[PDB]
Amino acid sequence: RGSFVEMVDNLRGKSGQGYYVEMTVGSPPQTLNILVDTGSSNFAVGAAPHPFLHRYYQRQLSSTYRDLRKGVYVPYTQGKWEGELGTDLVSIPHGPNVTVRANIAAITESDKFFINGSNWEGILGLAYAEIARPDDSLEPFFDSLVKQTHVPNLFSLQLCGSVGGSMIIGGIDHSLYTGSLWYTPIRREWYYEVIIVRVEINGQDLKMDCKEYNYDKSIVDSGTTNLRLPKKVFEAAVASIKAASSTEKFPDGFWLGEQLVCWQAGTTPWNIFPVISLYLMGEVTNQSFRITILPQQYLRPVEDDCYKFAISQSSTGTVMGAVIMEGFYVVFDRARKRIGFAVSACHVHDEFRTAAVEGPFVTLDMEDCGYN
Ligand SMILES: C[C@@]1(c2cc(NC(=O)c3ccc(Cl)cn3)ccc2F)C[C@@H]2C[C@@H]2C(N)=N1
Ligand code: NA
Ligand code: NA
C-alpha cells in the first residue's frame, strides 16, 4: 500500500491520441498496447489486419482462448466497432504479478475507431458492467481482476500531458501527488459518475442552477481529451472566459473548436487566460472541495506554436476528460464508491500558477445538483 515502483510510468502516448498500457493476452502471451478508458466498460482489441494497427490479437495462436459464440455491434456517435466475444488469459506486464481470465471483444470490423498513426490496438474499459456491451452480464476486466485475485478494488491514474503517466492497479502511490487527496462520491456505478456543485472562472462563479452542471450526468473519463460541458453551461463558461482574456481577441471559431490559434514560439500568453474551478460534492453533508486547472490543460498543443481550445459543449453531460485529469492524481476508489483528487506531481504549469485541490468548502443543497 502506498508504493508501487514497478507500475510507475507504465503509461505512454502521443498528444491527442490518449494514454495506453502494455497488456498481454492468451498463451503464449501476445503483447498489445491498450488505451486506458474510464469512460467505457469493454475490453476490446483489434483481431484482424486493419491497416492502422501495429499488431492485433490472433486468437488462433492462443491455447487458452474460449469462444463465447456471441457477437457484439458497438456504435458510437462518431464511429463503430463489431466483434466476437470470448475469454482468454490476460496480464499487465507493468502491473500486478497476476493473470486473469477476462472477456475480450475481438474486433473484426471497425470504422473511425482506431487512430491512424497511434501506437494502440485496443481499449480497456475500466467503468462498470451497467454500461458493458451487449449487456451487464459481460463482466468488465476490472471486475474479473478483483474476483479472481487479491488485488484491492481500486486503481489510480496519473496522466502527464511525448505523453505518459502511471496506472496503479490495486493501490495508490504517494509519490505521484502532492498535498492531500479529496474524495467525491461515485453517485452511481455505471460510468464514474460524480456531481459538480459549483463552477468558477478565475474565482468568479457562473451562478447557474447547479443542476445545469450535471445535465444529464457528469463523469470522469480518460478516453476523452476535452473538458466537455453541457451546452448551457458551456455558453456561460466561454462568455466568462472570453471576458477574462479580452486583453486579446480571437476568432469566434476558435472558442467553438473550429480553428486553431497560433503564437510565435515561446510566447503563448498563458497569463491572459483564466483558471477554471470545479467544486465537487464532498464526503460529508454540506461539505465540498474544488479542483482548479490552468490554460496549460485546456489549451492543447497541436503539431508557430498552434493550440486547440479543448473545452467543448456537450449533449451527454459534463465530461472530465484528459483536460481535467492531466492536472491531477485521480483515485478510482471502487471499494468505497468514491473518487479522489490530488495535485499531480507531474502536471504542466508555470512559475505563476499551479493546479489545485482545495477544501473544505461549505455548500448547501448539493443533492439538488444531480439530474434525475
Ligand atoms: C470507447 C470510447 C472511445 C475513446 C477513444 N479515445 C481516444 O481516442 C482518446 C484520444 C485522446 C485522449 Cl486524451 C483519450 N482518448 C477512441 C475511440 C473510442 F471509441 C468511445 C467514446 C469516446 C468515449 C470513450 N471514453 N470511449
Ligand atoms: Na479478490
Ligand atoms: Na505525496
Kindly state the greatest CA–CA separation across the chain.
Answer: 64
Counting from 1 in the atom list of ligand 1, the atom nearest the Cα of 123 is 1
Residue written as grid cell 463465447: 68
Ligand having the closest approach to the CA of 123: 1
Question: What's the burial of 269, exposed, middle or buried (CB within 10 Å: 0-12/13-18/19+)?
Answer: exposed
CA of 344 to the centre of ligand 3 (A): 9
Ramachandran area for residue 165 (φ above 0: left; ψ -120 to 50: alpha; else beta): left
d(CA 21, CA 166): 9
Going by the DSSP 8-state scheme, the letter that residue 110 receives in this structure is E
Ligand having the closest approach to the CA of 148: 2
Q: Per the structure block, which three cell numbers stand in for 50? A: 486493419
Counting from 1 in the atom list of ligand 1, the atom nearest the Cα of 44 is 1
Residues of the chain with CATH 2.40.70.10: 19-151, 152-372
CA of 38 to the centre of ligand 1 (A): 9
351: CB partners within 8 A, 6+ apart? none
| Torsion of Cα atoms, 331 then 333 then 336 then 342, to 10° | 0
Q: Per the structure block, which three cell numbers stand in for 35? A: 488505451
Query: Of residues 37, 143, 173, 333, which has the active-site annotation?
Result: 37
Position 305, amino acid: D
Assign 247 to helix, strand or coil.
coil
Class of the CATH domain delimited by 19-151? mainly beta
Assess whether 135 carries a catalytic annotation. Answer: no
Q: Per the structure block, which three cell numbers stand in for 327? A: 492536472
CA of 345 to the centre of ligand 3 (A): 8
CA of 19 to the centre of ligand 1 (A): 10
**Taking a C-beta distance cutoff of 8 angstroms, is the pair 171, 152 a contact?**
yes
Query: Rounded to whole angstroms, what are the CA distances from 257 to 249, 270, 300?
Result: 15, 18, 11
Assign 129 to helix, strand or coil.
helix
Fold for the domain defined by 152-372: Cathepsin D, subunit A; domain 1 (2.40.70)
256: CB partners within 8 A, 6+ apart? none
Ligand 1 site: residues with CB under 6 angstroms? 16-18, 35, 37, 39-40, 76, 113, 115, 123, 221, 223-225, 322
**Taking a C-beta distance cutoff of 8 angstroms, is the pair 139, 152 a contact?**
no
Position 176, amino acid: L
CA of 10 to the centre of ligand 2 (A): 23
Query: Rounded to whole angstroms, what are the CA distances from 36 to 121, 127, 158, 163?
Result: 11, 11, 11, 13
**Taking a C-beta distance cutoff of 8 angstroms, is the pair 43, 103 a contact?**
yes
Query: Rounded to whole angstroms, what are the CA distances from 274 to 15, 270, 288, 353?
Result: 23, 8, 22, 10
**Taking a C-beta distance cutoff of 8 angstroms, is the pair 163, 13 a contact?**
yes
176: CB partners within 8 A, 6+ apart? 8, 156, 158, 166, 168, 329, 344, 345, 346
Nearest CA to ligand 1 atom 11: 18
How many Cβ atoms are within 10 Å of 315's Cβ, its own excluded? 10
Q: Where are the alpha helices (DSSP H) in 196-317?
A: 231-244, 252-255, 295-298
CA of 164 to the centre of ligand 2 (A): 29
How many Cβ atoms are within 10 Å of 303's Cβ, its own excluded? 8
**Taking a C-beta distance cutoff of 8 angstroms, is the pair 167, 159 a contact?**
no
d(CA 297, CA 294): 5
Ligand having the closest approach to the CA of 177: 3
Query: Rounded to whole angstroms, what are the CA distances from 361 to 195, 282, 286, 320, 364?
Result: 15, 9, 8, 21, 10
Ligand having the closest approach to the CA of 142: 2
- Structure determined via: X-ray
Assess whether 37 carries a catalytic annotation. Answer: yes
Give the mutation target among 14, 224, 311 for probing the ligand 1 site: most ligand atoms within 8 A of CB. 224
**Taking a C-beta distance cutoff of 8 angstroms, is the pair 35, 18 a contact?**
yes
Assign 121 to helix, strand or coil.
coil
d(CA 61, CA 80): 26
210: CB partners within 8 A, 6+ apart? 196, 197, 198, 365, 366, 368, 369
Radius of gyration of the chain (CA): 20
Asked if the bond preceding 28 is cis, omega within 30° of 0, the reply is: yes
Query: Of residues 88, 143, 173, 221, which has the active-site annotation?
Result: 221
Residue written as grid cell 472530465: 320
Torsion over CA: 54, 60, 63, 65 (sign): positive
Q: Per the structure block, which three cell numbers stand in for 43? A: 475490453
Question: What's the burial of 283, exposed, middle or buried (CB within 10 Å: 0-12/13-18/19+)?
Answer: middle
Nearest CA to ligand 1 atom 12: 18
148: CB partners within 8 A, 6+ apart? 98, 100, 101
d(CA 213, CA 196): 6
Instruction: Kindly tell me the number of DSSP H helices and DSSP E strands found in the chain.
Output: 5, 26
CA nearest to 251, candidates 303, 199, 307 = 307
Q: Per the structure block, which three cell numbers stand in for 29? A: 502471451
The angstrom resolution of this structure is 2.3
- Residues lying with their CB under 5 A of ligand 3, a single-atom ion: 174, 177
